[PDB]
Amino acid sequence: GSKLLDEAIQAVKVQSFQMKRCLDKNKLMDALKHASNMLGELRTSMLSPKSYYELYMAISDELHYLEVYLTDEFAKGRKVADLYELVQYAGNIIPRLYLLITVGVVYVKSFPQSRKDILKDLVEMCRGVQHPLRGLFLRNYLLQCTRNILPDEGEPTDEETTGDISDSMDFVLLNFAEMNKLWVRMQHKRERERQELRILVGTNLVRLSQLEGVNVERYKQIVLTGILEQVVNCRDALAQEYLMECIIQVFPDEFHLQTLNPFLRACAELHQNVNVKNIIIALIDRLALFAHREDGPGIPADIKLFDIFSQQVATVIQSRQDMPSEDVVSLQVSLINLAMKCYPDRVDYVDKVLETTVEIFNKLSSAVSKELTRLLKIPVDTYNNILTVLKLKHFHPLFEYFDYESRKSMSCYVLSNVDQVDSIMNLVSTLIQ
Numbered sequence: 001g002s003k004l005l006d007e008a009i010q011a012v013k014v015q016s017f018q019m020k021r022c023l024d025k026n027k028l029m030d031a032l033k034h035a036s037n038m039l040g041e042l043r044t045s046m047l048s049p050k051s052y053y054e055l056y057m058a059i060s061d062e063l064h065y066l067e068v069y070l071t072d073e074f075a076k077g078r079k080v081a082d083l084y085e086l087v088q089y090a091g092n093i094i095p096r097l098y099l100l101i102t103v104g105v106v107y108v109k110s111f112p113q114s115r116k117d118i119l120k121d122l123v124e125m126c127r128g129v130q131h132p133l134r135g136l137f138l139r140n141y142l143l144q145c146t147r148n149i150l151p152d153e154g155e156p157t158d159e160e161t162t163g164d165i166s167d168s169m170d171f172v173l174l175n176f177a178e179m180n181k182l183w184v185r186m187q188h189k190r191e192r193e194r195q196e197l198r199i200l201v202g203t204n205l206v207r208l209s210q211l212e213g214v215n216v217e218r219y220k221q222i223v224l225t226g227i228l229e230q231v232v233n234c235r236d237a238l239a240q241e242y243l244m245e246c247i248i249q250v251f252p253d254e255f256h257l258q259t260l261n262p263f264l265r266a267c268a269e270l271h272q273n274v275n276v277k278n279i280i281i282a283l284i285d286r287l288a289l290f291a292h293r294e295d296g297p298g299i300p301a302d303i304k305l306f307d308i309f310s311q312q313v314a315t316v317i318q319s320r321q322d323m324p325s326e327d328v329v330s331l332q333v334s335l336i337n338l339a340m341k342c343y344p345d346r347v348d349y350v351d352k353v354l355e356t357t358v359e360i361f362n363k364l365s366s367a368v369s370k371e372l373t374r375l376l377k378i379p380v381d382t383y384n385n386i387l388t389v390l391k392l393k394h395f396h397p398l399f400e401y402f403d404y405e406s407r408k409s410m411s412c413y414v415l416s417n418v419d420q421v422d423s424i425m426n427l428v429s430t431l432i433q
Contacts, residue, residue, distance in 0.1 A: 005051045008041045009058055016062040023069050032087060032099065035066055039095035042134060049133060049193045056137045059098075060144070067102050067145065076110040093128055097138060100125060101145045108149050116163030119146060119171055127178060132186040133197075139179050140200045143172070143207050153213040165213030172211075173226040176204035180243075184236050191238070198242045205243075205250045219255050220262075228266045237273035244270070248282045253290035256283060257303055264312035268319040276316055277327040284309065284334045291342055299342065306339045306349050314356070325364060329371040332357045336375060340382050347391050350379055354394035361401050369403045373410055380417050390420050396427060408432050 015038035022031040038059055047055060074080055084107045090096035104122050108115045126142055129135045150171065151163035179201045186194050208214055208223055224247070231243045247263070248256070256263065263283070267276050291299050299305055313331050317323060332353050339349035357375065376398060383389050399407060411428040418425075 001046070001048055001051055004044070004046050005055055008044070008047075008055050011041055012038045012055070012058050012062070016065075019062060019066065023066070023073075026073075028070070028073075028083065029086065031066065032083065035063065035099060035102075036087075036090055036095045038062065039098050040092060042098070042137070043092060043094050045131070045133075049196050052133060052137065053196075056141075060141055063098065063102050063141075064145075067106060070103070070106045071109055074106075074110060078110070080107050080110055094134060094138065097125055097129060098141065101142055105145050105149060112158070112160040113162050115149060115151065115161060116167050119150070119163065119167065122146065123171055123174055123178075126175070130182075132182045135182040136179060136186075136197055136200045139175055139182075140203060142175060143203050146171075147207070150207075150211065151213075152211050165211060165218070168211055168213065169208070169218065169222055169226075172204050172207050173223070176201070176227070177230050179204060180230050180234065180239065183239060184234065187236070194238060198239070201239070202242070202246045202250075205246050209250045209252075216255050216258050219251065220259050224255075224259050224262065228262065232266050232269045235271060237271040240270050241274045241279065244274075244279050245282060248279070248286060253286050254297075256287065257290075257299065260303075260305075260308045261312065264308070264316065267312070267316050272321050275327075276320065277323075277330055280309075280313060280316065280331060281334050284338055288338065288341070305342055306335075306346070309338060310335055310352070310356070317360070324367070325360075326368040326371050328360055329357065329368060329375055333371065333375045333378065336378055337382075340378070344382075347388060351392040351394055354392060354398055358394050358397050361398070366403065369406045372398065372402065373406060376410060377413065380414060384417070386414075386417060386421070389414075390424070396424065399428075399431065 015034045019031050019034040019038070022028070022034065041055060042052075042059060044052075070080060070083070080103065084100070084103045087096065087099035087103050090099060101122050104118045108118050122142060126135070126139050129138050150168040151161065151165055152168065153165055155161060183194070183197065183201050186197070205227065214223055227243070227247060231240055231247075234240050234243070244267070260283075264280065267279055270276055270279075287299070287305065290296070291305075313335060317328055317331065336350055336353040339346055339353060343349055354375075357372075376395065379389060379392060379395070380386075389395060399410060402410060408431065411431055414428060415425075
């Protein structure tokens, strides 16, 4: 594999030397011939994703040098129109499509009134390449190359620009849908390779987050709905867990607060092998950071975090075929610390979590016990006032579900923290037996 790449890089170097040579002598059609030559190296199927990525990055280096060179050399000149019709006649589809994206972007910058139509075409032309790997990189280049000519709201007031933020969304979202199709087809043994290319698909989400026109409104109405639709119908646990964690990370915490329901609603329908635990915990933590943030707008009081999460988590757990009990307690643990540093005066919340955990346990190892001691240590650490712990009625029923030595160590920990008071003392003491 590395010999094959070594011979590819070596052809790339010699062709880009002549391309950059014919550019200096202002021999642009010769330049584009050598570009079409080096682009022929991307047609191979004998390179792993890691090797192909090295060959791709060696190539897009020179194409981007050809892009800015055609842009500078012409200002707003009409000649790019000759080059854009020229490259349309290239022999092989891969070299033709890379050059159409490259020249098309230069074409838009000296014909701003043709922007919307060029962008539309470029994304449809990419549909012609169906190979998963080559299609992934080709459409990856499509994002980067058109990165700075997508219609956005922070645009200058100049006339002559065609397209608006609506068109950019459809552009990226359509590319996202097509890139995701290609990604699931790669599965047909190191799946370690598919994991590497998850970022190619993830770039569509990044590019959306960096469009200034994507506000909380268009995000809730158009963007997230488009993304989740592709994620839920994906039917692949690798892609689903990545894309959902990519949504949490990429978009701001101000967007998630207005889309907590449809997001957690999509967490239920995810494939059974997805770790919906880690997803939900991630979203909860990002909102804990956003709640305890200085100089920022906290969680508005009309957004009941504990309500939205306790219900939706109950629905997420309910839909999991074989979710480990250990993980079932983790969600409660994140549900119980959410209910005490976002709503400290809410003692009713904490007992509801514990009660809910009791229910789950009635219908049912060391792993889960390490998580239950976590769950019961949180109230006593937060409530250094056992008078408050007296109120939690389901604190002690959950004691009943421990490992025998774990029962005494938790009970020892509650006593180290020190009618109802003396009647809970005789109960813990009995279990020490």
